[PDB]
Enzyme design. Sequence first.
Site, PDB file in Angstrom:
ATOM      1  N   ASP A 158      31.455 -42.425 -20.454  1.00  0.00           N
ATOM      2  CA  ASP A 158      30.828 -41.532 -19.492  1.00  0.00           C
ATOM      3  C   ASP A 158      31.125 -40.105 -19.930  1.00  0.00           C
ATOM      4  OD1 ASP A 158      31.261 -41.129 -15.846  1.00  0.00           O
ATOM      5  OD2 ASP A 158      29.687 -40.440 -17.227  1.00  0.00           O
ATOM      6  N   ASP A 161      26.465 -34.902 -23.227  1.00  0.00           N
ATOM      7  CA  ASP A 161      25.726 -34.746 -24.477  1.00  0.00           C
ATOM      8  C   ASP A 161      26.363 -33.717 -25.405  1.00  0.00           C
ATOM      9  OD1 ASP A 161      24.120 -35.981 -22.467  1.00  0.00           O
ATOM     10  OD2 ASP A 161      22.320 -35.539 -23.643  1.00  0.00           O
ATOM     11  N   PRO A 168      33.101 -29.809 -29.217  1.00  0.00           N
ATOM     12  CA  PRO A 168      33.927 -30.892 -29.759  1.00  0.00           C
ATOM     13  C   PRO A 168      33.426 -32.280 -29.367  1.00  0.00           C
ATOM     14  CG  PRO A 168      34.973 -30.009 -27.845  1.00  0.00           C
ATOM     15  CD  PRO A 168      33.832 -29.066 -28.173  1.00  0.00           C
TER      16      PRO A 168
END
Lengths: 309, 313, 313, 309
Positions: A158, A161, A168
């Site tokens: 979870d 994007d 990172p």
Amino acid sequence: MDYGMYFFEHVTPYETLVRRMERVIASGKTPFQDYFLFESKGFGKVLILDKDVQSTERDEYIYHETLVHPAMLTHPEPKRVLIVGGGEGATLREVLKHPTVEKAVMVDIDGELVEVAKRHMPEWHQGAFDDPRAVLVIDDARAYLERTEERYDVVIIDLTDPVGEDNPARLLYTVEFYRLVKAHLNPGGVMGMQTGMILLRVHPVVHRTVREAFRYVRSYKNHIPGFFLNFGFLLASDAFDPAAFSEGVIEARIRERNLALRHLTAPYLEAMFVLPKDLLEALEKETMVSTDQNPFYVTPEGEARQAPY
Amino acid sequence: MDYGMYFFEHVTPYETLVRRMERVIASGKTPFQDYFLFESKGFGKVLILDKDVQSTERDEYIYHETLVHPAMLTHPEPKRVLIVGGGEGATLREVLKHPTVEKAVMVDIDGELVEVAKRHMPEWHQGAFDDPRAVLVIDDARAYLERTEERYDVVIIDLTDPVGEDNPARLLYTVEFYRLVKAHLNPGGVMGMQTGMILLTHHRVHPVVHRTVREAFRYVRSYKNHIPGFFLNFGFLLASDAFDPAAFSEGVIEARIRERNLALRHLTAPYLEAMFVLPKDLLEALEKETMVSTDQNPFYVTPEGEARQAPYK
Amino acid sequence: MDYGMYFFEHVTPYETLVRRMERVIASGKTPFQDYFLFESKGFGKVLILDKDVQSTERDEYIYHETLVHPAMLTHPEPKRVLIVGGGEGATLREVLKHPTVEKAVMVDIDGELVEVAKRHMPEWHQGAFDDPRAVLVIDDARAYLERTEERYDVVIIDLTDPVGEDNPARLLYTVEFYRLVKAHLNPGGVMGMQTGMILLTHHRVHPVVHRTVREAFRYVRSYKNHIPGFFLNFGFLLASDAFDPAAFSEGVIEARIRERNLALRHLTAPYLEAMFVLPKDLLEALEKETMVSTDQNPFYVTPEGEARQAPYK
Amino acid sequence: MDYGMYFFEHVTPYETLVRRMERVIASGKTPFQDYFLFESKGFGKVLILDKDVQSTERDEYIYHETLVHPAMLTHPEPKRVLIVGGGEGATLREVLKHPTVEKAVMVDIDGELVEVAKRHMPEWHQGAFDDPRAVLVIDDARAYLERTEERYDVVIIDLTDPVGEDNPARLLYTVEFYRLVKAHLNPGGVMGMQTGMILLRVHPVVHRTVREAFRYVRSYKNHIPGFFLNFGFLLASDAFDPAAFSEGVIEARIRERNLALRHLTAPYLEAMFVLPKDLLEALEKETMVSTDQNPFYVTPEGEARQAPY
């Protein structure tokens, strides 16, 4: 629209959502990102992380049921689950509803953010962090996975994007990351994840990248009201095709596990895997595979890019 | 965010969409509504009617296929079709793709708007208005149907929500309007329509439209699809007295698609069928809804985007 | 432009100011108006009342000096002062800088708002409410003046524009209100007030306020100053029956500034005098204005930001 | 505010003006900048150049009278005038009202923009370009000045602030530029210019830079309705103090030249030179001088910077 306090939410480079804030509950900055939590009359409390909506109080059940149960239900008996991300505590909440769950480890990088959720987002965690089966670990997912050696029946990713070259998050969307995840799966294990918004290449690229790591990769989608977006998700496994639904099986498991679902039904869950012609083509034609060498990221203009981190 | 030209689009009382305009193609005001047509980098041409986006060049195929084909494909042989609304001409376009069609009557109140489409929106109509089988009628669809006794196999309703108490379009969303429509359907006729956005936390427009249609039709089946350019999940529905419009067979729809050489870019037989599979929360919202719009108390959309009723005139 | 929290501030029907909010200090609703106080990077704390900016931390000194000192300095020895409005406490603050002041009565209808200022806006009041010479009265300034017979040397009116027909504050902008105020002025008294934004192309609020005041005072003199944080040129005025408030001498004002050890950060004697020098267009707008607000037909500001009249109740 | 078409105007990095567009008359891009011309119900036609409002139909007389007449009126008999910038044609319009004007040369870099004004902004030029005394020259101000050798009685600089490091406007705001301008002045010549918005250092820096080139530099300001901003301007001369107004002189000249003013009056013009205490201090303390070596520019955050171009 009415004058007043508003939050300018980035959606695409050409469309911006201006959401009315009735009151600001909390706003600040952690060492990893900025956060804004406000009251809205429609969706209730809304959490913004940086410039994008992270979750809304009144529609999060849809997102979290969609994110968690397809993977959990497709697994005949999940006992150990790993959640990567899901800082609000709702992903853990849904995972913990499966009675076969004995241990659920949640790994998140931003402890300060988790604290914000604990104190101001009780509607999300609903006491899930205090479940004896729950284990919160504040750390980098890869670092944790590289060190640990415990395996899981189900892994739920979870995350957000990888938009932005310096983000990172790029390192958590490479084929190596998915292989690292797969390494921590028990035989017959399944992985479920949110795979980016769908809009006329993030989702197709993630699907292609994951497929470079798993034998069976199945995209599914669902409209998330509070995001005003169609979101892509996927199930991945090497042990079996997670979307090869046998008549009555999903339904039987929901009943057997006495899951209290508010959005999903067995037929609706399976229908999420039925994709339109245009999406199928996009998935089919995608050729980019994100790698540690050249991690893919999305440009501010929403384009798929790939180069060394 | 950047500086430049933008359109502030109404979505809900608490959420507004700010869309970047690359350049403005046309803008104006007919005696019925304000219109704006502009070029956007993401969705191409965008048409706004009053304060809400009406259509997008790059995603309209999704909306029109979703709106038209379920009804057209559930009918074994649609020959006469009536279209209420669909001023852009793309609804007619999709209807005309079915070779069994011999006549398609389109009735819409705003002739000037249709003219804007004809001139600036060829991407939508693609010549449909000039199809020999197409008959364009500029008039109140209700006055037109009462003043006629022609019958149809399929009726498509493509109208915007009736916003505002003083909005005369409220009369196109009452049970007697749907009964009037049903009175013009051949024995195995079916009605298909766009039935409002679905945003259960904000309002129940879709369930109110569905509940109202159920009061005029034996079998009513809702279906939904996310419309990219609208950034909204939209409700639609199929209605009939002759059969349960959702009692398919993926096989039959597939065969009809192939038979009619329908060129589809979004729908597939299995996806079309899946649009009729609804989640628990939507099913409950549909089930519990009690509001029935009637000529006596037509429903309308309040400035808070809520469905409300009030005695007409 | 960037993403983040912003306040959409009403300016005119065609121009809106979108101000970035660094963090929100307080927000709420008293029985009279909505209030929002937030931190801005450019102007520091910003207070919004309903839909319009009321004050800015970094530029309020300009507004309050402009509002208060011309009247206070044109008076040879102001001992009793009445303040209508000025809920932030900065108006009182500037009034109290004059050592000749023995008493300063401040009457404002919104006690809760004053409480917000006391707690979150010390930068404005700077302790003025606790000055032994200050008397705070929470009440309708009109009911208070009719219910009293105290007299003042200087009266400062610091209120927002009366927006909306149903706004009871309309009664604080009528000729009988100003006559009531004049009835409480000592022989050589003078009234000073903020008199609305000046934006001649959009509306004539300032000239309507000036024209209304002229109907109650012998000598009325408008003056203006640009208020940085408001991004607007504001009109103000001095009024008196005893003398032409603008018939100065740069020398006398300078001497009074020095005499009273007034600490000024914006005004100087010559700049204060120059505020009374108006351009041709403003002079003509002031001269031609015919609207006089009265209890019978009080003026108010329409949603189009225009000054309109209508019979009360 | 009402839904509809709007233009997002940058004002500062923390305040943005959202102006309602009733209709877009013309919008495009030249090789030098983007332009947007739209109808607004309040100010009438509005011209946007890039991201900042350049001028509005119903308030431009204020800006142009303020920009032109103080310099023109303080000069006993201007016969030759040079306008640098002022592409709308209104600066020329005001200059041409002085009967002693025999020649008025206007130099502007963007010929395409001037064409936009000619065709869509007749309210501004009002036929001024067709005046026999007017001479339009499309070129770089410095280039033109470096080549030409004709001198002028009055030079009016109507340019935009040098905001942005890569902005070529930087080279038109250096002490060398002002010296080049001064070189093209007849004895007794005066220079008038718009000198940036005033808001709690562009104006003070320009004032200081100009003072490094002229003996007498006098700042004056005026609120420009359509810009929602207080603007700074200045007069500069080596021959005399342009702001040392002798009783009745300005008034006599206005009458003698039969100027049709709509905003200015003799007393109001002189009052523009009366500055508040805070502005005087800002001007007084400013130490930065823009140079060809290190041209000053303003950062997106509105800060005064200086380094090689």
